[PDB]
């Protein structure tokens, strides 16, 4: 019944391998044990194997694979690769070697080169410390997408959305997205929504204006983002410049935005910027009592996810499941 | 308890008269009926009386007073008055006559000359068409640095705010407020929250950042508005650059904004602009199932309030109540 339960189950039927670089935190090892036992994924622990066996104790980690960044066969391939990416930003080959000794950095490079389908981390690292290797190493830029954070949001007795479930448009990362940024966030978000919720995405480019009902510089940005996004992905339902009520309430839709592909039915909210996106998600979580999952990152070439530093070991398990399912989209 | 009952209560003990010009829209007449029956206020309906009787039907509006702008005794006084105001902006006396035939314009001129203590409109008109007569006829108050609009919002099973009740920082008018504008809106909103909710205002300058957790052009704007507002009104509890969770949730307030006059207890949300504001309000209303009254303006010489075009007749009732209460301040 619960969103997280659909994901974990889906994850088992899939056969993805996720890397866990924080092997000097118990929660990581506790979560791995439960993951391997429950069949959720195959696991690569990045760290010292002697040191892991000594921290693990009673935990059954026999099914996992241990990769030590300072002895692994492909070490030189991984340093060269990071050197190539970072070469023109003041990184020398010897710097790369040093930077590529960090477990997180090494794990992200494993997803980049195919040994692993995604990475989960952040129990024992700042958000920006997690984001940095992701952005530097796994970065994608082939088309209509941009790295961003989103939330899945499940409102309790809710008739709107996909059975009360929505995705929110960068409620946790890109602070001041440009017009293009917003367009691109809208497209990638439709794909994420489709993959994670398994329902037809209906994207609403939010505003205080519904359809020329008001006009300003903020209103023009939203409209311009809508039109660009419609060009970028004409096969997705995207309607633009919509207030929340016109976006999700059929009766409102009927007066303010009659005959729209999205108005009245919206299940994806795209925000003008992080002020709105963060404020909207908090209001939904706290005043609407919604369950919120995030921040989950999207827009990367491989799924790398960040965790709350106060996460529980069950929090890590869930995160692995979601990552595995995002790995389903990015197939081959 | 419903905010409607409470604001409907104080409004009863006051004895104010509100004009309702949108008489060709059922919701107005349905609301008028409930108002007059519940004893909330005296009402003037501005329109054609024959037309209203026909549209009203079974609704009891006998207690109300109907004023037709095209037959009213003082019609000429009202035309002359608007002509004086608008005289030097290219309006002829004949133009005045035509403009002053509009129901809303006339209702606004009624509050200006004393026949009425306030107006409520906007169920059947754009926000900017509701504001225009206010701005031209009543104009801005003397103290007030600017007019702005807001929403009282009451969330159902809510432990946060003032028994689930909040005031939202221009979720219905000023589209792109400057740093000074945001500061001034914070201050005036504090006094409005105090008047209408009857509780200590705890003003939160909203953001995606909590207390230096992030840094950007948007973040500095919020902090600068915070600091200005603290200078404009040092006796008010205003803390700045807070995420919604740190603003209202004691446990998050404890970690992200320790020892703050506001964090954990906020009951007034001030937004960076109308995008956040309007989006925030609709989300509270439709996802949190909150009751939502407004946008209510502040800073005019007389209470002229707006409505959501998708309001219920009961929303109009609540708006008339608040209008009445605002009119008690302004003697």
XYZ file of C-alpha atoms in Angstrom:
663
model
C 0.000 0.000 0.000
C 2.742 2.578 0.978
C 4.929 4.277 -1.632
C 8.145 3.005 -0.089
C 6.752 -0.570 -0.013
C 5.925 -0.591 -3.763
C 9.494 0.558 -4.400
C 11.262 -1.994 -2.189
C 9.223 -4.793 -3.741
C 9.842 -3.520 -7.262
C 13.507 -3.309 -6.329
C 13.670 -7.072 -5.543
C 12.312 -8.070 -8.977
C 14.987 -5.812 -10.474
C 18.559 -6.939 -10.128
C 20.647 -3.836 -9.487
C 23.941 -3.453 -7.607
C 24.384 -0.413 -5.324
C 27.675 0.795 -3.772
C 27.813 1.876 -0.124
C 31.002 3.955 0.555
C 30.368 4.806 4.276
C 31.723 1.519 5.635
C 33.076 3.037 8.839
C 29.534 3.813 10.047
C 27.531 0.848 11.517
C 24.231 1.948 10.054
C 25.719 1.339 6.609
C 26.700 -2.186 7.539
C 23.400 -2.767 9.362
C 21.464 -1.626 6.307
C 23.593 -3.823 3.980
C 22.780 -6.924 6.062
C 19.068 -6.223 5.835
C 19.345 -5.366 2.097
C 21.165 -8.596 1.177
C 18.880 -10.677 3.360
C 15.671 -9.094 2.029
C 16.847 -9.478 -1.589
C 16.510 -5.749 -2.322
C 19.905 -5.455 -4.143
C 23.416 -6.746 -4.644
C 25.954 -4.688 -2.690
C 29.482 -3.388 -3.092
C 30.942 -2.083 0.174
C 33.824 0.299 -0.456
C 36.423 0.194 2.252
C 39.025 -1.876 4.071
C 37.879 -5.475 4.385
C 39.855 -6.183 7.524
C 38.376 -3.044 9.096
C 34.828 -3.924 7.908
C 34.927 -7.479 9.319
C 35.976 -5.905 12.654
C 33.147 -3.293 12.616
C 30.497 -5.695 11.317
C 30.637 -8.304 14.054
C 27.594 -10.584 14.020
C 26.112 -9.006 10.855
C 25.875 -11.329 7.829
C 27.694 -9.450 5.032
C 29.006 -12.600 3.245
C 26.833 -11.988 0.180
C 28.322 -8.440 -0.346
C 31.412 -7.559 -2.342
C 34.230 -5.532 -0.781
C 36.348 -3.246 -2.853
C 39.275 -1.409 -1.277
C 40.206 1.734 -3.296
C 43.911 1.256 -2.497
C 44.246 -2.355 -3.709
C 41.431 -2.808 -6.321
C 42.671 -4.052 -9.728
C 41.185 -1.146 -11.746
C 42.598 1.600 -9.469
C 44.712 3.116 -12.257
C 41.781 3.183 -14.677
C 39.711 5.075 -12.044
C 42.429 7.686 -11.356
C 43.039 8.295 -15.089
C 39.288 8.699 -15.598
C 38.977 11.262 -12.825
C 42.065 13.000 -14.122
C 40.427 13.336 -17.580
C 37.231 14.821 -16.133
C 38.951 17.141 -13.742
C 42.103 17.759 -15.858
C 41.290 21.279 -16.987
C 40.135 22.487 -13.546
C 43.560 22.469 -11.906
C 43.784 18.776 -11.008
C 47.138 17.097 -11.610
C 47.490 13.345 -12.059
C 48.879 13.079 -8.543
C 45.986 15.125 -7.082
C 43.556 12.730 -8.826
C 45.331 9.835 -7.215
C 44.849 11.368 -3.755
C 41.215 12.440 -4.341
C 40.426 9.070 -5.849
C 41.396 7.363 -2.547
C 38.210 8.591 -0.857
C 35.561 5.872 -0.609
C 32.634 8.079 -1.795
C 34.587 9.398 -4.811
C 35.633 5.844 -5.698
C 32.084 4.504 -5.491
C 30.683 7.231 -7.742
C 33.394 6.329 -10.286
C 32.237 2.717 -10.096
C 28.699 3.779 -11.132
C 30.253 5.929 -13.852
C 32.186 2.969 -15.302
C 29.579 0.213 -14.987
C 30.650 -1.903 -11.990
C 27.638 -0.524 -10.083
C 24.216 0.854 -10.975
C 24.107 3.591 -8.322
C 25.434 4.904 -5.012
C 23.882 5.797 -1.683
C 25.700 7.907 0.866
C 25.521 10.846 3.303
C 24.925 9.193 6.677
C 28.429 10.395 7.673
C 29.072 13.244 5.210
C 27.661 16.700 4.566
C 25.175 17.033 1.673
C 27.577 19.147 -0.353
C 30.303 16.535 0.285
C 28.069 13.927 -1.276
C 26.929 16.128 -4.117
C 30.402 17.152 -5.228
C 31.718 13.754 -6.498
C 28.287 13.160 -8.081
C 28.225 16.371 -9.972
C 31.937 16.030 -10.975
C 31.957 12.384 -12.004
C 28.564 11.080 -13.026
C 27.297 14.395 -14.582
C 24.999 14.091 -17.642
C 24.426 16.685 -20.398
C 23.065 14.851 -23.471
C 19.752 16.735 -23.602
C 16.570 17.704 -21.764
C 17.669 17.305 -18.122
C 19.592 19.036 -15.285
C 20.777 17.700 -11.945
C 18.114 18.541 -9.364
C 16.382 17.369 -6.203
C 12.783 16.393 -5.860
C 10.394 14.920 -3.371
C 7.678 12.360 -3.645
C 4.788 13.641 -1.583
C 1.840 11.561 -0.345
C -1.018 13.630 1.083
C -3.305 11.537 3.424
C -7.013 11.848 2.549
C -6.282 13.343 -0.840
C -8.495 13.024 -3.938
C -6.041 15.056 -6.078
C -2.824 13.956 -7.728
C -2.089 10.304 -8.279
C -4.109 9.058 -5.250
C -2.748 11.933 -3.167
C 0.803 11.490 -4.465
C 2.852 14.147 -6.257
C 6.363 14.931 -7.254
C 7.759 18.379 -6.373
C 10.088 20.443 -8.683
C 13.297 21.042 -7.056
C 12.370 21.522 -3.522
C 15.966 20.883 -2.413
C 18.931 21.857 -4.685
C 18.988 24.227 -7.684
C 18.366 27.546 -5.944
C 17.853 30.024 -8.790
C 17.081 28.034 -11.920
C 16.956 29.992 -15.145
C 14.071 29.781 -17.582
C 15.821 26.849 -19.380
C 16.710 25.193 -16.069
C 13.024 25.148 -15.148
C 12.009 23.750 -18.502
C 14.601 21.019 -18.253
C 13.608 20.259 -14.639
C 10.009 19.868 -15.824
C 10.945 17.245 -18.435
C 13.245 15.128 -16.296
C 10.625 15.329 -13.475
C 7.908 13.877 -15.730
C 10.262 10.925 -16.424
C 11.051 10.445 -12.758
C 7.435 10.636 -11.798
C 6.539 8.076 -14.402
C 9.275 5.727 -13.312
C 8.653 6.025 -9.547
C 4.905 6.426 -9.216
C 4.002 4.363 -12.350
C 1.318 6.698 -13.593
C 0.972 9.185 -16.414
C 2.770 12.407 -15.412
C 0.753 15.618 -15.733
C 3.185 18.479 -15.214
C 2.030 21.885 -13.821
C 4.394 24.894 -14.157
C 3.246 26.689 -11.024
C 2.518 30.367 -10.520
C 0.206 32.825 -8.739
C -1.319 33.383 -12.171
C -3.497 30.875 -13.973
C -3.733 31.773 -17.650
C -2.893 35.372 -18.217
C -4.981 36.187 -15.135
C -1.981 38.272 -14.099
C 1.140 39.510 -15.813
C 4.615 40.370 -14.581
C 8.291 39.468 -15.031
C 7.745 36.338 -12.823
C 4.721 35.352 -14.880
C 6.669 35.705 -18.125
C 9.415 33.402 -16.899
C 6.925 30.683 -16.045
C 5.205 30.920 -19.417
C 8.528 30.937 -21.275
C 9.570 27.816 -19.302
C 6.280 26.146 -20.180
C 6.667 26.808 -23.923
C 10.282 25.704 -24.000
C 9.439 22.479 -22.071
C 6.596 21.786 -24.516
C 9.093 22.051 -27.404
C 11.662 19.853 -25.601
C 9.159 17.098 -24.901
C 5.960 17.458 -26.937
C 4.721 13.993 -25.923
C 4.379 14.861 -22.227
C 1.378 16.637 -20.702
C 2.706 20.001 -19.604
C 0.572 23.048 -19.079
C 1.898 26.309 -17.904
C 1.258 29.191 -15.645
C -1.177 27.526 -13.293
C -2.066 28.190 -9.722
C -2.102 25.184 -7.449
C -5.920 25.146 -7.406
C -6.266 25.304 -11.158
C -3.595 22.613 -11.418
C -5.245 20.000 -9.145
C -8.948 20.886 -8.621
C -11.198 19.869 -11.595
C -13.859 22.461 -10.809
C -11.306 25.231 -10.652
C -9.764 23.913 -13.820
C -13.108 24.111 -15.581
C -13.360 27.922 -15.150
C -9.737 29.059 -15.158
C -8.054 26.654 -17.573
C -10.804 24.882 -19.560
C -9.622 22.156 -21.945
C -6.063 21.739 -20.617
C -3.910 18.569 -20.893
C -2.921 19.076 -17.219
C -5.241 21.517 -15.349
C -7.440 19.629 -12.898
C -5.362 16.490 -13.070
C -1.835 17.579 -12.173
C 0.477 15.196 -10.326
C 3.778 17.013 -10.869
C 4.494 20.476 -9.415
C 7.334 22.520 -10.972
C 8.439 25.568 -8.956
C 9.844 28.921 -10.018
C 12.756 28.531 -7.640
C 13.891 26.914 -4.373
C 12.090 29.436 -2.138
C 8.724 28.197 -3.444
C 9.776 24.598 -3.895
C 11.190 24.243 -0.423
C 8.323 26.196 1.188
C 5.717 24.210 -0.691
C 7.142 20.838 0.346
C 7.431 21.877 4.024
C 3.890 23.220 4.044
C 2.650 19.909 2.553
C 4.653 17.735 4.914
C 3.803 19.721 8.082
C 0.371 21.396 7.505
C -1.088 18.780 5.147
C 0.569 15.917 7.092
C 2.072 14.515 3.923
C 4.733 11.851 3.893
C 7.810 13.244 2.137
C 10.587 11.270 0.557
C 13.655 13.263 -0.365
C 15.779 14.791 -1.163
C 16.278 12.313 -3.988
C 18.491 13.551 -6.766
C 17.563 13.328 -10.422
C 19.242 14.530 -13.560
C 22.482 12.574 -13.161
C 23.935 9.949 -15.563
C 23.702 7.373 -12.792
C 21.697 7.462 -9.532
C 23.672 8.854 -6.662
C 21.602 9.616 -3.616
C 22.244 11.703 -0.499
C 20.951 10.877 2.962
C 20.089 12.849 6.057
C 23.030 12.679 8.550
C 20.474 11.683 11.196
C 19.072 8.820 9.088
C 18.202 5.474 10.588
C 19.517 2.231 9.209
C 15.975 1.666 7.748
C 16.247 5.049 6.029
C 19.381 3.731 4.196
C 17.554 0.568 3.100
C 14.705 2.608 1.567
C 17.205 4.909 -0.158
C 18.919 1.880 -1.724
C 15.553 0.666 -3.006
C 14.688 4.018 -4.649
C 18.158 4.237 -6.178
C 17.703 0.703 -7.610
C 14.401 1.756 -9.224
C 15.905 4.932 -10.676
C 18.545 2.563 -12.100
C 15.735 0.788 -14.006
C 15.054 3.871 -16.089
C 18.676 4.378 -16.933
C 18.845 0.929 -18.512
C 21.949 0.014 -20.523
C -12.895 25.841 16.598
C -13.554 27.518 13.246
C -11.968 30.966 12.620
C -15.285 31.917 10.937
C -17.154 31.502 14.291
C -14.641 33.580 16.153
C -14.317 36.383 13.612
C -18.130 36.111 13.187
C -18.476 36.567 16.969
C -16.394 39.771 17.512
C -17.966 41.170 14.342
C -21.433 40.729 15.882
C -20.643 42.867 18.937
C -19.354 45.594 16.601
C -22.078 47.286 14.551
C -20.619 47.921 11.126
C -22.170 48.189 7.686
C -20.463 46.582 4.703
C -21.232 47.129 1.022
C -21.413 44.160 -1.348
C -21.349 45.312 -5.011
C -21.215 41.887 -6.771
C -25.006 41.469 -6.672
C -25.232 39.651 -10.048
C -23.290 36.731 -8.540
C -25.364 34.325 -6.373
C -22.603 33.743 -3.843
C -22.853 37.379 -2.784
C -26.604 37.174 -2.131
C -26.270 33.774 -0.461
C -23.571 35.211 1.798
C -25.548 38.398 2.476
C -28.427 36.211 3.732
C -26.227 34.261 6.135
C -24.589 37.519 7.321
C -27.848 39.309 8.124
C -29.311 36.191 9.791
C -26.171 35.478 11.900
C -26.091 39.160 12.975
C -22.542 39.619 11.616
C -23.140 43.016 9.964
C -25.617 45.380 8.316
C -25.421 45.148 4.525
C -25.765 47.409 1.545
C -26.242 45.548 -1.742
C -25.219 47.719 -4.693
C -27.176 46.937 -7.874
C -30.629 46.826 -9.510
C -33.245 45.893 -6.891
C -35.646 44.266 -9.393
C -32.734 42.184 -10.714
C -31.651 41.184 -7.205
C -35.186 40.088 -6.125
C -35.269 37.943 -9.233
C -31.839 36.429 -8.583
C -32.301 36.012 -4.812
C -35.380 33.801 -4.893
C -35.997 32.064 -1.561
C -33.060 33.877 0.158
C -34.094 36.297 2.950
C -32.492 39.685 2.106
C -35.307 41.859 3.564
C -33.025 43.190 6.316
C -30.509 44.512 3.657
C -30.531 47.897 1.965
C -30.413 48.114 -1.809
C -28.727 51.070 -3.528
C -28.892 51.429 -7.313
C -26.043 53.651 -8.590
C -28.366 54.935 -11.337
C -31.246 56.058 -9.056
C -29.629 56.750 -5.675
C -30.405 60.184 -4.183
C -26.715 61.149 -3.713
C -25.727 59.988 -7.238
C -24.514 63.476 -8.241
C -22.502 63.970 -5.053
C -20.715 60.714 -5.847
C -20.006 61.687 -9.447
C -18.693 65.098 -8.373
C -16.477 63.497 -5.736
C -14.844 61.047 -8.166
C -14.466 63.918 -10.660
C -12.465 65.913 -8.032
C -10.220 62.914 -7.228
C -9.638 61.903 -10.816
C -9.926 65.414 -12.308
C -6.248 65.990 -13.136
C -5.617 62.502 -14.587
C -7.656 63.088 -17.779
C -11.171 62.376 -16.484
C -14.003 64.684 -17.626
C -17.218 65.108 -15.647
C -19.040 62.932 -18.214
C -16.331 60.240 -17.845
C -16.794 60.416 -14.081
C -20.512 59.779 -14.590
C -19.893 56.651 -16.702
C -17.169 55.226 -14.390
C -19.226 55.921 -11.262
C -22.077 53.811 -12.744
C -20.093 50.678 -11.899
C -21.369 48.861 -8.797
C -17.958 48.305 -7.204
C -16.748 51.908 -7.861
C -19.902 53.214 -6.273
C -19.597 50.901 -3.241
C -16.040 52.096 -2.742
C -17.195 55.714 -2.906
C -19.799 54.825 -0.215
C -17.060 53.747 2.211
C -15.153 56.954 1.326
C -18.086 59.247 2.236
C -19.269 57.395 5.367
C -22.515 55.670 4.208
C -20.611 52.398 4.666
C -17.636 51.206 6.788
C -16.102 48.883 4.202
C -16.504 46.925 0.985
C -15.930 43.265 0.037
C -15.666 42.245 -3.619
C -13.686 40.076 -6.031
C -15.794 36.882 -6.464
C -16.612 38.017 -10.036
C -13.794 40.514 -10.790
C -10.058 40.413 -11.351
C -7.903 41.339 -8.340
C -6.560 44.369 -10.243
C -10.117 45.530 -11.130
C -11.034 45.307 -7.436
C -7.922 47.190 -6.356
C -8.233 50.011 -8.882
C -11.313 51.725 -7.324
C -9.771 51.276 -3.843
C -6.488 52.806 -4.922
C -8.145 55.704 -6.783
C -10.883 56.620 -4.298
C -9.874 55.511 -0.758
C -6.100 55.554 -1.367
C -3.339 54.548 0.990
C -3.435 55.276 4.691
C -1.118 57.956 6.185
C 1.254 55.801 8.241
C 1.394 52.802 5.881
C 4.419 52.605 3.568
C 2.220 50.629 1.075
C -0.880 48.537 0.530
C -0.602 44.706 0.557
C -2.882 41.707 0.821
C -2.931 38.615 3.033
C -4.911 35.469 3.995
C -5.961 34.179 7.370
C -5.477 30.465 7.128
C -6.825 27.864 9.579
C -5.497 24.353 9.318
C -7.778 21.619 10.782
C -5.901 19.191 13.135
C -3.012 21.464 13.577
C -0.762 21.879 16.629
C 1.232 24.667 14.846
C 0.491 28.372 14.559
C -2.152 30.000 16.791
C -4.383 26.945 17.190
C -3.690 26.058 13.532
C -4.243 29.662 12.403
C -1.726 31.661 10.407
C -1.501 34.834 8.419
C 0.216 34.698 5.001
C 2.420 37.560 3.643
C 0.997 38.824 0.517
C -0.450 35.894 -1.162
C -2.767 38.164 -3.121
C -1.521 41.528 -4.404
C 2.064 42.828 -4.423
C 3.610 40.656 -7.081
C 7.298 41.571 -6.809
C 7.970 43.340 -3.481
C 11.389 44.876 -2.951
C 13.453 44.230 0.172
C 11.895 47.323 1.862
C 8.428 46.224 0.716
C 8.909 42.758 2.296
C 10.089 44.360 5.574
C 7.104 46.773 5.681
C 4.692 43.960 4.850
C 6.170 41.982 7.773
C 5.489 44.807 10.201
C 1.979 45.699 9.135
C 1.116 41.966 8.982
C 2.155 41.612 12.607
C -0.380 44.277 13.633
C -3.102 42.760 11.479
C -2.472 39.287 12.891
C -2.690 40.765 16.393
C -5.955 42.539 15.661
C -7.742 39.663 13.892
C -6.358 36.558 15.539
C -5.996 38.106 19.025
C -2.695 36.431 19.741
C 0.948 37.440 19.864
C 2.337 37.732 16.295
C 5.394 35.606 15.705
C 6.607 36.685 12.267
C 8.756 34.336 10.116
C 10.580 35.602 7.037
C 10.371 32.439 4.912
C 13.068 30.920 2.742
C 14.640 27.594 1.670
C 17.457 28.472 4.014
C 17.286 28.422 7.781
C 20.167 30.308 9.360
C 22.959 30.515 6.900
C 22.320 26.919 5.816
C 22.552 28.237 2.304
C 23.670 31.403 0.653
C 22.375 33.103 -2.471
C 20.936 36.319 -3.876
C 17.505 35.183 -2.721
C 18.781 34.378 0.747
C 20.416 37.771 1.255
C 17.196 39.488 0.238
C 15.365 37.632 2.977
C 17.994 38.377 5.601
C 18.085 42.051 4.608
C 14.329 42.313 4.837
C 14.574 40.671 8.255
C 17.072 43.108 9.537
C 15.251 46.106 8.182
C 11.993 44.925 9.748
C 13.662 44.385 13.125
C 14.754 48.029 12.952
C 11.334 49.322 11.859
C 9.651 47.468 14.715
C 11.990 46.212 17.480
C 9.181 45.318 19.871
C 7.802 42.617 17.509
C 9.014 39.026 17.391
C 10.475 38.710 13.898
C 13.210 36.187 12.983
C 14.637 35.859 9.573
C 15.590 33.380 6.973
C 13.666 30.373 8.210
C 12.365 27.330 6.448
C 8.738 26.474 7.165
C 9.714 23.578 9.413
C 12.106 25.546 11.566
C 9.500 28.374 11.742
C 6.750 26.149 13.202
C 8.290 22.919 14.513
C 9.900 23.158 17.986
C 12.226 20.202 17.504
C 13.588 21.527 14.142
C 13.724 25.030 15.655
C 15.832 23.661 18.484
C 18.578 22.353 16.098
C 18.525 24.800 13.146
C 17.541 28.105 14.864
C 18.410 27.860 18.581
C 17.306 30.603 20.954
C 15.051 32.500 18.523
C 12.177 34.820 19.325
C 10.111 33.124 16.560
C 11.464 29.720 15.444
C 9.215 26.908 16.592
C 6.276 29.201 17.345
C 5.698 31.130 14.140
C 2.153 32.147 13.262
C 2.809 34.712 10.559
C 4.467 33.627 7.305
C 6.058 36.340 5.175
C 6.930 35.349 1.583
C 9.662 36.546 -0.824
C 7.038 37.238 -3.489
C 3.622 36.439 -4.911
C 4.682 33.145 -6.528
C 5.606 31.644 -3.079
C 2.786 33.386 -1.358
C 0.008 32.388 -3.646
C 1.382 28.868 -4.099
C 1.778 28.493 -0.340
C -1.780 29.577 0.330
C -3.369 27.329 -2.300
C -1.339 24.402 -0.967
C -2.545 25.102 2.567
C -6.101 25.395 1.381
C -6.292 22.412 -0.982
C -3.792 19.871 0.346
C -3.904 20.802 4.066
C -7.679 21.466 3.751
C -7.244 24.776 5.493
C -9.949 27.387 5.557
C -8.805 30.511 3.786
C -10.146 34.032 4.050
C -8.971 36.809 1.729
C -6.680 38.139 0.366
C -7.393 40.834 2.906
C -5.788 44.164 2.189
C -4.105 46.386 4.757
C -2.824 49.935 4.485
C -5.904 51.571 2.873
C -7.724 54.469 4.539
C -10.856 52.275 4.515
C -11.274 48.472 4.471
C -11.823 47.443 0.834
C -11.221 43.691 0.645
C -10.737 41.312 -2.296
C -11.956 37.705 -2.761
C -10.787 34.608 -4.619
C -12.845 34.161 -7.798
C -13.344 30.575 -6.636
C -14.626 31.489 -3.147
C -17.667 29.940 -1.479
C -20.567 32.039 -0.184
C -19.254 31.220 3.334
C -15.823 32.628 2.405
C -17.644 35.938 1.644
C -19.265 35.826 5.085
C -15.849 35.430 6.751
C -14.485 38.295 4.618
C -17.320 40.616 5.657
C -16.518 39.765 9.337
C -12.814 40.609 9.076
C -13.702 43.795 7.173
C -15.933 44.846 10.039
C -13.178 44.124 12.554
C -10.638 46.117 10.558
C -13.179 48.974 10.586
C -13.150 48.984 14.398
C -9.458 49.993 14.330
C -9.991 52.886 11.886
C -12.256 55.362 13.872
